[PDB]
Design an enzyme around this catalytic site. Structure first.
Site, PDB file in Angstrom:
ATOM      1  N   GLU A 258      86.571 116.272  27.694  1.00 22.47           N
ATOM      2  CA  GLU A 258      86.866 114.888  27.906  1.00 22.47           C
ATOM      3  C   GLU A 258      86.540 114.009  26.345  1.00 22.47           C
ATOM      4  O   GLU A 258      87.373 113.247  26.278  1.00 22.47           O
ATOM      5  CB  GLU A 258      86.031 114.268  29.028  1.00 22.47           C
ATOM      6  CG  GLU A 258      86.504 114.729  30.273  1.00 22.47           C
ATOM      7  CD  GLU A 258      87.821 114.998  30.640  1.00 22.47           C
ATOM      8  OE1 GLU A 258      88.680 114.115  30.080  1.00 22.47           O
ATOM      9  OE2 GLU A 258      88.508 116.170  31.060  1.00 22.47           O
TER      10      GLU A 258
ATOM     11  N   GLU B 260      90.009 111.423  30.721  1.00 19.85           N
ATOM     12  CA  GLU B 260      89.477 111.051  29.539  1.00 19.85           C
ATOM     13  C   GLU B 260      89.589 109.549  29.218  1.00 19.85           C
ATOM     14  O   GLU B 260      89.503 109.102  28.029  1.00 19.85           O
ATOM     15  CB  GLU B 260      90.162 111.867  28.313  1.00 19.85           C
ATOM     16  CG  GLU B 260      91.518 111.377  28.106  1.00 19.85           C
ATOM     17  CD  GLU B 260      92.585 112.671  28.602  1.00 19.85           C
ATOM     18  OE1 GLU B 260      92.214 113.248  29.789  1.00 19.85           O
ATOM     19  OE2 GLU B 260      93.648 112.716  28.232  1.00 19.85           O
TER      20      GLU B 260
ATOM     21  N   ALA C 140      88.455 116.348  35.625  1.00 14.42           N
ATOM     22  CA  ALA C 140      88.010 114.935  35.146  1.00 14.42           C
ATOM     23  C   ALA C 140      89.151 114.284  34.363  1.00 14.42           C
ATOM     24  O   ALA C 140      90.259 114.843  34.379  1.00 14.42           O
ATOM     25  CB  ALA C 140      86.951 115.492  33.828  1.00 14.42           C
TER      26      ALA C 140
END
Ligand SMILES: O=C(CN1C(=O)CSc2ccc(Cl)cc21)NC1(C(=O)O)CCCCC1
Ligand SMILES: [Zn+2]
Length: 854
Positions: A307, A273, A271
């Site tokens: 995140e 951010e 992932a």
């Protein structure tokens, strides 16, 4: 004309304040065009502006002042430094605003970074193409020319031109959509707050969304492909709860009107951010209540927590330079546990934290590990900072510091640090200064020992009546001094006692003699412990007779430390194996998993050697050790997340090792599932064991692969990939590597994991190292030198070798690459790991053979 700048770092005297980015991507040709306008000021007279640009074709550059005057700029490029130089016909006046305007074109990247292409197929069979961004660390310069270093913060106003059939999203809300020439629409997003270039994001896609508003009024949304938006609700609810948690915890509101979480069909890391537009692998966000595993549910929660922590630790406050990336990553990793411990108490995530510290210690015990803060310069070296030292050692030293200062003092230090440095950049010393401002306990000398020196200490304890002697030394496989906040409990006191060891040795006097003493309570400290004299016998007896006298995590710490001490000749392999015998009565996930973490690698070494007899006896010993716990497992999805994860792992282990009660049960589920044409919902927790057994025949492998193309479940796709990778048909193993490398039938985002799973297959392991060597250049082009993906491929395919011939294969291959990989840190890590495996097996193989017979 020679290039007028000779440093990798940009000049410090031309500073941006605001960027206006107009981007038009043409998804039918994969070309994109942009106009970047960057408002700058110069603090020194200069006629030259140096900035970053990589693989962009610049058609025109102009300098505006105001009263508007334009001046054409001459453009020079230095592709190796990824810089361009813009030359003005007269010097810029110091302190006055100017606007650099650059028109350019590029092609969407076929990698997972920059402004890149992602695809998926509808359930109906249509190939759909989208475009998304991934800039951290140094790829924003591949989408727009910029001052692409994290301390050149600026605001960004983004405009995207797109076809009406597509949706565009970016960091900030959409404020207006305007029809422009040639059937396009130009979306205008609001200006961002001041932030680093690596956090800019934009996506052009067909995504659906769902939303929910926090108590503070922030609109949180999950975006995903239409066929998967029905899997968005778990993450949407978790994101709202976690954003509310952090706003309260930090006393600093989230500053943007909305926060999006987008599941991208192709994504390299887990992932990212990006402020206002966080992005994820579909597996890290999307939850199918019928097919997702318990580990997946935990992972989505922790990934969303990570995140969202970054909105404060990384976005609001950013490291000045990549040498201190741990200020972003160690904090985000640690805040997953601080937050989820409160928001989702049913997951009991604090119970798992220590395992991240043992992951960091594996790497950090090697001679060439790097300090948490260490110098880096070029993009490949910066990407190497995204490693277990920045993330896991960073989180573990913050956990140790929080326990030392107390949670309330540490929280006050966090809050002061975030408030003082909001919208700015920090270095290590700022964090120590903040933590000490609470005038509290000074943290600088202590925390410099944990951030500026590699490795960690071995603490040796020697008890003589009430006298407890302590010593520290660097723990290393194959001068150092720390300020170590020790903790201990004893047979007479389960209060956590504290002692700060700042020196080579010290002594403390217990109030009364004890039967045993156990240091590093809960494994909250980044160190290991050895006990002289009868110490290991006393703790072995405690585990054998009354194991619940210490917590589950304390039993896991003793298992780990006993085996780590074999590696440096402080405890014999026989004594560590004798201690592991207590696991026949262990019930808890952490110590069972720690036993697997220490014992399974031993047979993984044997599988690649001429050691069939001892390999067989060692695997039989492991199954015998855990047999009662394996037999107690139900073939259901019942229980807590820990009970589910323990069940799944134990049934898979038993089936892989041909434990007939489990194999027969798995064969029956697979046959019934296959005969029902996959209609039959299987318990998710037994699916890995069932599929691994079923894929052992050619009919079962083919049937399982036939269901893969229809699956919308990230867990089911992962479980099928794992099972297919256990085949002992080398043509099928080579097909998995070829097809995931190509990315059509199996996406290339799964290739790193598939290559390591095949590298760990007992029959096909040579194929993985072979594939890596043969396809190295293309793999580097796709994933990048220095990436965590390349690091995992190098370690995954080689770190279970234990012969001098395999060590030379690795040294010879990587040294032959010269600038294309010879200097990777992962290569030195795997060389040192293989050197340790050779020495460990030479010292202990016969001892293990004799022990198994006795
Ligand atoms: O061994 C591995 C993968 N693996 C390693 O390669 C060494 S590190 C490690 C630590 C813990 C566990 Cl559970 C597995 C580990 N998996 C199994 C095997 O025998 O290959 C055995 C477990 C069932 C799935 C297969
Ligand atoms: Zn992170």
């Amino acid at each position: 004309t020679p290039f007028p700048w000779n440093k990798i770092r940009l000049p410090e005297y031309v500073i941006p304040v605001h960027y206006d980015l107009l981007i038009h991507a043409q998804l039918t040709t994969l070309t994109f065009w942009g106009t970047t306008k960057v408002e700058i000021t110069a603090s020194q007279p200069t006629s030259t502006i140096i900035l970053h640009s990589h693989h962009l074709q610049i058609s025109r550059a102009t300098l505006r002042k105001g009263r508007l005057s334009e001046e054409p700029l001459q453009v020079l490029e230095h592709p190796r430094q990824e810089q361009i130089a813009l030359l003005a016909p007269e010097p810029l006046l110091v302190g006055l605003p100017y606007t650099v305007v650059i028109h350019y074109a590029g092609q969407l990247s076929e990698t997972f970074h920059g402004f890149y292409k992602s695809t998926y197929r509808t359930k109906e069979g249509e190939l759909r193409i989208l475009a998304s961004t991934q800039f951290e660390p140094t790829a924003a310069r591949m989408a727009f020319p910029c001052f692409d270093e994290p301390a050149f913060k600026a605001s960004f106003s983004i405009k995207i031109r797109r076809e009406p059939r597509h949706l565009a999203i970016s960091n900030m809300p959409l404020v207006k959509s305007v029809t422009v020439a040639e059937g396009l629409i130009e979306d205008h997003f609001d200006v961002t707050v001041k932030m680093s270039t690596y956090l800019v994001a934009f996506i052009i896609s067909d995504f659906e969304s769902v939303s929910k508003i926090t108590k503070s009024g922030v609109k949180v949304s999950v975006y995903a492909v239409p066929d998967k938006i029905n899997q968005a609700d778990y993450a949407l609810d978790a994101a709202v709860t976690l954003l509310e948690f952090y706003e309260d915890y930090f006393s600093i509101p989230y500053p943007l009107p909305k926060q999006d979480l987008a599941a991208i069909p192709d994504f390299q890391s887990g992932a990212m951010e990006n402020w206002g537009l966080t992005t994820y692998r579909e597996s890290a966000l999307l939850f199918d209540a019928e097919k997702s595993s318990a580990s997946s549910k935990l992972g989505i929660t922790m990934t969303v927590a990570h995140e969202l922590a970054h909105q404060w630790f990384g976005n609001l406050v950013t490291m000045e330079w990549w040498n201190d990336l741990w200020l972003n990553e160690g904090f985000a990793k640690f805040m997953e546990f601080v937050s989820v411990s409160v928001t989702h108490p049913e997951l009991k995530v604090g119970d798992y934290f220590f395992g991240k510290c043992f992951d960091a210690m594996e790497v950090d015990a090697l001679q060439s590990s790097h300090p948490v803060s260490t110098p880096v310069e070029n993009p490949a070296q910066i990407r190497e900072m995204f490693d277990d030292v920045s993330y896991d050692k960073g989180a573990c030293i913050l956990n140790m510091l929080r326990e030392y200062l107390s949670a309330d003092a540490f929280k006050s230090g966090i809050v002061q640090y975030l408030q003082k440095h909001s919208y700015k950049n920090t270095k290590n010393e700022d964090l120590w200064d903040s933590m000490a401002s609470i005038g509290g306990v000074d943290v600088k000398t202590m925390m410099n020992t944990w951030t500026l020196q590699r490795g960690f200490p071995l603490i040796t304890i020697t008890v003589r009546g009430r006298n407890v002697h302590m010593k520290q030394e660097h723990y290393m496989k194959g001068g150092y001094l720390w300020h170590v906040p020790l903790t201990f409990i004893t047979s007479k006191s389960d209060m956590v006692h504290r002692f700060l060891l700042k020196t080579k040795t010290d002594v403390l006097i217990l109030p009364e003699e004890v039967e045993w003493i156990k240091f590093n309570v809960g494994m909250n400290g980044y160190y290991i412990v050895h006990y002289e004299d009868d110490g290991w016998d006393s703790l072995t007896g405690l585990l054998k007779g009354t194991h619940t006298a210490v917590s589950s995590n304390d039993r896991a710490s003793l298992i780990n430390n006993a085996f780590q001490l074999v590696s440096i000749g402080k405890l014999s392999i026989e004594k560590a194996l004798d201690l592991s015998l207590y696991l026949k009565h262990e019930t808890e996930i952490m110590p069972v998993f720690q036993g697997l973490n220490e014992l399974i690698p031993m047979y993984k070494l044997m599988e690649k050697r001429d050691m069939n007899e001892v390999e067989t006896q060692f695997k039989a010993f492991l199954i015998r050790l855990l047999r009662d716990l394996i037999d107690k497992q139900t073939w259901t999805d019942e229980g807590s997340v820990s009970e589910r994860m323990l069940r799944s792992q134990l049934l898979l282990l038993a089936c892989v090792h041909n434990y007939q009660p489990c194999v027969q049960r798995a064969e029956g589920y697979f046959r019934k599932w296959k005969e029902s044409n996959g209609q039959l919902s299987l318990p998710v927790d037994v699916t890995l064991a069932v599929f691994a057994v079923g894929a052992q025949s050619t009919e079962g492998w083919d049937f399982l692969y036939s269901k893969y193309q229809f699956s919308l479940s990230s867990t089911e796709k992962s479980q099928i990939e794992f099972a297919l990778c256990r085949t002992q048909n080398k043509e099928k193993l080579q097909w998995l590597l070829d097809e995931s490398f190509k990315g059509d039938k199996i996406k290339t985002q799964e290739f790193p994991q598939i290559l390591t799973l095949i590298g760990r297959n007992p029959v096909g392991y040579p194929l993985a190292w072979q594939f890596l060597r043969k396809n190295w250049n293309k793999l580097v082009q796709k994933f990048e030198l220095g990436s965590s993906s390349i690091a995992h491929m190098v370690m995954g395919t080689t770190n279970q070798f234990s012969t001098r011939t395999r060590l030379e294969e690795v040294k010879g291959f990587f040294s032959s690459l010269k600038e294309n990989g010879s200097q990777l840190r992962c290569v030195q890590q795997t060389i040192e790991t293989i050197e340790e495996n050779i020495g460990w097996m030479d010292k202990n193989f016969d001892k293990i053979r004799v022990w198994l017979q006795s």
